[PDB]
Design an enzyme around this catalytic site. Structure first.
Site, PDB file in Angstrom:
ATOM      1  N   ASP A   1       7.748 -10.905 -28.274  1.00 46.75           N
ATOM      2  CA  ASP A   1       8.874  -9.992 -28.090  1.00 46.75           C
ATOM      3  C   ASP A   1      10.066 -10.452 -28.898  1.00 46.75           C
ATOM      4  O   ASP A   1       9.839 -11.044 -29.970  1.00 46.75           O
ATOM      5  CB  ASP A   1       9.188  -9.887 -26.594  1.00 46.75           C
ATOM      6  CG  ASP A   1       9.781  -8.540 -26.195  1.00 46.75           C
ATOM      7  OD1 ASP A   1      10.933  -8.242 -26.588  1.00 46.75           O
ATOM      8  OD2 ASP A   1       9.098  -7.741 -25.511  1.00 46.75           O
TER       9      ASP A   1
ATOM     10  N   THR B   1       0.802  -1.218   0.000  1.00 49.45           N
ATOM     11  CA  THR B   1       0.000   0.000   0.000  1.00 49.45           C
ATOM     12  C   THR B   1       0.831   1.260   0.000  1.00 49.45           C
ATOM     13  O   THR B   1       0.294   2.367  -0.071  1.00 49.45           O
ATOM     14  CB  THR B   1      -0.930   0.000   1.227  1.00 49.45           C
ATOM     15  OG1 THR B   1      -0.181  -0.329   2.391  1.00 49.45           O
ATOM     16  CG2 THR B   1      -2.048  -1.045   1.064  1.00 49.45           C
TER      17      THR B   1
ATOM     18  N   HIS C   1      15.777  -7.761 -24.678  1.00 49.10           N
ATOM     19  CA  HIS C   1      14.511  -7.133 -24.234  1.00 49.10           C
ATOM     20  C   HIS C   1      13.471  -8.144 -23.809  1.00 49.10           C
ATOM     21  O   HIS C   1      12.809  -8.104 -22.764  1.00 49.10           O
ATOM     22  CB  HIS C   1      14.017  -6.255 -25.368  1.00 49.10           C
ATOM     23  CG  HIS C   1      12.778  -5.467 -25.135  1.00 49.10           C
ATOM     24  ND1 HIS C   1      11.529  -5.931 -25.440  1.00 49.10           N
ATOM     25  CD2 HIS C   1      12.596  -4.207 -24.651  1.00 49.10           C
ATOM     26  CE1 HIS C   1      10.628  -5.002 -25.146  1.00 49.10           C
ATOM     27  NE2 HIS C   1      11.251  -3.945 -24.665  1.00 49.10           N
TER      28      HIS C   1
ATOM     29  N   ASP D   1      -2.559   7.474  -5.861  1.00 46.00           N
ATOM     30  CA  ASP D   1      -1.254   7.597  -5.218  1.00 46.00           C
ATOM     31  C   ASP D   1      -0.138   8.047  -6.146  1.00 46.00           C
ATOM     32  O   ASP D   1       0.984   8.329  -5.672  1.00 46.00           O
ATOM     33  CB  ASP D   1      -0.855   6.263  -4.568  1.00 46.00           C
ATOM     34  CG  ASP D   1      -1.843   5.897  -3.468  1.00 46.00           C
ATOM     35  OD1 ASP D   1      -2.296   6.780  -2.706  1.00 46.00           O
ATOM     36  OD2 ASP D   1      -2.224   4.725  -3.376  1.00 46.00           O
TER      37      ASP D   1
ATOM     38  N   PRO E   1      -9.141  -0.478 -27.224  1.00 46.99           N
ATOM     39  CA  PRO E   1      -9.856  -0.380 -25.960  1.00 46.99           C
ATOM     40  C   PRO E   1     -10.026  -1.665 -25.183  1.00 46.99           C
ATOM     41  O   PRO E   1     -10.106  -1.626 -23.939  1.00 46.99           O
ATOM     42  CB  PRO E   1     -11.284   0.074 -26.348  1.00 46.99           C
ATOM     43  CG  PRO E   1     -11.105   0.684 -27.692  1.00 46.99           C
ATOM     44  CD  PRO E   1      -9.980  -0.052 -28.370  1.00 46.99           C
TER      45      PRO E   1
ATOM     46  N   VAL F   1      -8.131  -4.371 -24.653  1.00 43.88           N
ATOM     47  CA  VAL F   1      -6.980  -4.974 -23.982  1.00 43.88           C
ATOM     48  C   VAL F   1      -6.556  -4.087 -22.816  1.00 43.88           C
ATOM     49  O   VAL F   1      -7.130  -3.019 -22.577  1.00 43.88           O
ATOM     50  CB  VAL F   1      -5.813  -5.192 -24.965  1.00 43.88           C
ATOM     51  CG1 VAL F   1      -6.274  -6.115 -26.093  1.00 43.88           C
ATOM     52  CG2 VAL F   1      -5.261  -3.873 -25.494  1.00 43.88           C
TER      53      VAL F   1
ATOM     54  N   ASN G   1       6.366   4.994 -24.971  1.00 40.01           N
ATOM     55  CA  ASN G   1       7.363   5.770 -24.248  1.00 40.01           C
ATOM     56  C   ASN G   1       7.547   7.148 -24.865  1.00 40.01           C
ATOM     57  O   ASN G   1       8.669   7.662 -24.899  1.00 40.01           O
ATOM     58  CB  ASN G   1       8.713   5.046 -24.226  1.00 40.01           C
ATOM     59  CG  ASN G   1       8.713   3.783 -23.392  1.00 40.01           C
ATOM     60  OD1 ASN G   1       7.741   3.398 -22.750  1.00 40.01           O
ATOM     61  ND2 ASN G   1       9.872   3.111 -23.385  1.00 40.01           N
TER      62      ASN G   1
ATOM     63  N   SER H   1       7.580  -1.022 -21.488  1.00 37.16           N
ATOM     64  CA  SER H   1       7.894  -2.432 -21.724  1.00 37.16           C
ATOM     65  C   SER H   1       8.148  -3.197 -20.427  1.00 37.16           C
ATOM     66  O   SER H   1       7.960  -4.417 -20.430  1.00 37.16           O
ATOM     67  CB  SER H   1       9.148  -2.638 -22.576  1.00 37.16           C
ATOM     68  OG  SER H   1       8.906  -2.325 -23.917  1.00 37.16           O
TER      69      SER H   1
ATOM     70  N   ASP I   1      -5.382   1.750 -18.805  1.00 40.79           N
ATOM     71  CA  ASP I   1      -6.165   1.045 -17.810  1.00 40.79           C
ATOM     72  C   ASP I   1      -5.539   1.003 -16.417  1.00 40.79           C
ATOM     73  O   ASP I   1      -6.202   0.903 -15.385  1.00 40.79           O
ATOM     74  CB  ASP I   1      -6.452  -0.406 -18.251  1.00 40.79           C
ATOM     75  CG  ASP I   1      -7.255  -0.486 -19.525  1.00 40.79           C
ATOM     76  OD1 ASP I   1      -8.467  -0.189 -19.429  1.00 40.79           O
ATOM     77  OD2 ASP I   1      -6.671  -0.782 -20.579  1.00 40.79           O
TER      78      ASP I   1
HETATM   79  N1  BRV Z   1       8.082   0.776 -28.463  1.00 36.32           N
HETATM   80  C1  BRV Z   1       8.945   1.145 -27.476  1.00 36.32           C
HETATM   81  C2  BRV Z   1      10.196   1.738 -27.718  1.00 36.32           C
HETATM   82 BR1  BRV Z   1      10.635   1.985 -29.556  1.00 36.32          BR
HETATM   83  C3  BRV Z   1      11.073   2.122 -26.724  1.00 36.32           C
HETATM   84  C4  BRV Z   1      12.372   2.821 -27.015  1.00 36.32           C
HETATM   85  O1  BRV Z   1      12.394   3.983 -27.490  1.00 36.32           O
HETATM   86  O2  BRV Z   1      13.410   2.174 -26.752  1.00 36.32           O
HETATM   87  C5  BRV Z   1      10.706   1.883 -25.394  1.00 36.32           C
HETATM   88 BR2  BRV Z   1      11.876   2.304 -23.955  1.00 36.32          BR
HETATM   89  C6  BRV Z   1       9.470   1.312 -25.102  1.00 36.32           C
HETATM   90  C7  BRV Z   1       9.041   1.086 -23.663  1.00 36.32           C
HETATM   91  O3  BRV Z   1       8.145   1.885 -23.309  1.00 36.32           O
HETATM   92  O4  BRV Z   1       9.562   0.191 -22.973  1.00 36.32           O
HETATM   93  C8  BRV Z   1       8.610   0.955 -26.124  1.00 36.32           C
HETATM   94 BR3  BRV Z   1       6.917   0.191 -25.736  1.00 36.32          BR
END
Ligand code: BRV
Ligand code: BRV
Ligand code: BRV
Ligand code: BRV
Length: 279
Positions: free
Chosen positions: A39, A16, A69, A260, A175, A177, A161, A224, A200
């Protein structure tokens, strides 16, 4: 069960409050469930997977992870030290090349693969798919993700990102997933995390320690990294009988730590994945 000196994100998932370092979870630990990691692959021979990981499909010359990754994401789902669901079965589907890239047609094929392939696997407690990937909006990519979900797989996808609205990314913008943003150890939105109404849930995504190729470990950051926390959480909660593939995203939001996180834009949910485990 209690794991001392756990990665911060595992401790966060069972707390928490931020700032603790022990992960608490029911010993069932996702036994009987399955998580597909779609992946760059999974280094299944890593000692951290304990024989519970396997490659089941590749679209390239090898099913090995020559990037890291995928192995990292798989580690957060289900490795013994770094994973949320430490007894799940992990299935790798290599839709990304060893540079971390992949064509959408390949990614779509891999999603439809999983929807069928689960019928070839033993997953009595349910099936999850973790998609730490994405690019720009594509209705075909979203549709594939929607089919996978519809087929009875809990689909968790990275929000992206770009520190932008995830509406313009796929499969993030689908929507139906579970679209996952990232937070840091001080309960701040990660600086890179996308946001928006299509999100979500948030999970830990900044400075996440997990497995890497060559039998190693490292700390990296991304949505990721948040996505497999949620995927593993789903698998764990399905094994407990608390929810199902079709309802798990909603259940995680229902049971999340609420309000939070800091720097959550107006209109984005302020919900942090939480296992509500009472030791
Ligand atoms: N598609 C994607 C890419 Br391209 C990159 C990146 O620019 O390396 C990252 Br860090 C992420 C993540 O958010 O982990 C993702 Br999802
Ligand atoms: N996440 C986090 C950590 Br790690 C630490 C720490 O140094 O262990 C502290 Br003191 C706090 C706090 O602000 O109390 C927080 Br929040
Ligand atoms: N028909 C039906 C079933 Br069966 C289940 C289930 O698997 O228990 C769920 Br979680 C839902 C729902 O998602 O609301 C529905 Br509607
Ligand atoms: N449930 C809930 C939450 Br979570 C938050 C929040 O995001 O912190 C706010 Br600002 C409100 C409110 O509008 O008072 C409510 Br009600």
């Amino acid at each position: 069960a209690a794991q001392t000196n756990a990665p911060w994100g595992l401790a966060r998932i069972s707390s928490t409050s931020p700032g603790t370092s022990t992960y608490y979870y029911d010993e069932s630990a996702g036994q009987g469930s399955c998580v597909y990691v779609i992946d760059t692959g999974i280094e299944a021979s890593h000692p951290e997977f304990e024989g519970r990981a396997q490659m089941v499909k590749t679209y390239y010359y090898s099913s090995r992870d020559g990037n890291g990754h995928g192995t990292h994401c798989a580690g957060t789902v289900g490795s013994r030290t770094y994973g949320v669901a430490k007894k799940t079965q992990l299935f790798g589907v290599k839709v990304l090349d060893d540079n971390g890239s992949g064509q959408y047609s390949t990614i779509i094929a891999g999603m439809d693969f999983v929807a069928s392939d689960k019928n070839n696997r033993n997953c009595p407690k349910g099936v999850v798919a973790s998609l730490s990937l994405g690019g720009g909006y594509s209705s075909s990519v979203n549709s594939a993700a929607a089919r996978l979900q519809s087929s009875g797989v809990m689909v968790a996808v990275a929000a992206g990102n770009n520190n932008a609205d995830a509406r313009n990314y796929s499969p993030a913008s689908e929507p139906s997933v579970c679209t996952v943003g990232a937070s840091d150890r001080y309960d701040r939105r990660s600086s890179f995390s996308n946001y928006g109404s299509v999100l979500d849930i948030f999970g830990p995504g900044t400075d996440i320690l997990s497995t890497w190729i060559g039998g190693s470990t490292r700390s990296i950051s991304g949505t990721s990294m948040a996505t497999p926390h949620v995927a593993g959480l789903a698998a764990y909660l399905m094994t407990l009988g608390k929810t199902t593939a079709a309802s798990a995203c909603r259940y995680i939001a229902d049971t999340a730590n609420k309000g939070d996180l800091s720097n959550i834009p107006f209109g984005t949910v302020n919900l942090l994945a939480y296992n509500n485990y009472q030791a």
